[PDB]
Amino acid sequence: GIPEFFQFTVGPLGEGGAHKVRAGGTGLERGVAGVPAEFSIWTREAGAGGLSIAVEGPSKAEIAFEDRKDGSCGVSYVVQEPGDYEVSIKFNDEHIPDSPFVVPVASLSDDARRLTVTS
């Protein structure tokens, strides 16, 4: 070896697809009590593998993959009630730094404050 072009000396040894793993959408900012939400997840680059998704929160959120973007994977999920939802997506164990990501859901609170919705 002799990269020096990083991609290996980068630091986090690339960790693998952890770099091509892209995830950006509105469902990646907030959700509402029992309201269908979704976000995009582009991939198809590192190569075949697995994608584990550990969700945690006051309720079990649903998940729905939809290949309808010409290239971006649409993962539609559904939250049940406000709180701090946490998801961990890893492409073949390539857990992105964000994972565990955070998805604050709000019931007519758009914020669910520990003083308004008071928990």
């Binding site: 991939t43 075949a48 593998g49 697995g50 994608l51 584990s52 998704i53 550990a54 969700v55 945690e56 929160g57 006051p58 309720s59 079990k60 959120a61 998940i63 993959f65 709180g83 701090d84 928990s119």
Partner: peptide
Amino acid sequence: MASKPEKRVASSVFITLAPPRRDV
């Protein structure tokens, strides 16, 4: 306060990308 219940509820599910037999 001290949330008596340990953390909130938990959930675990996922899938995997495994296209048909490679033949490209």
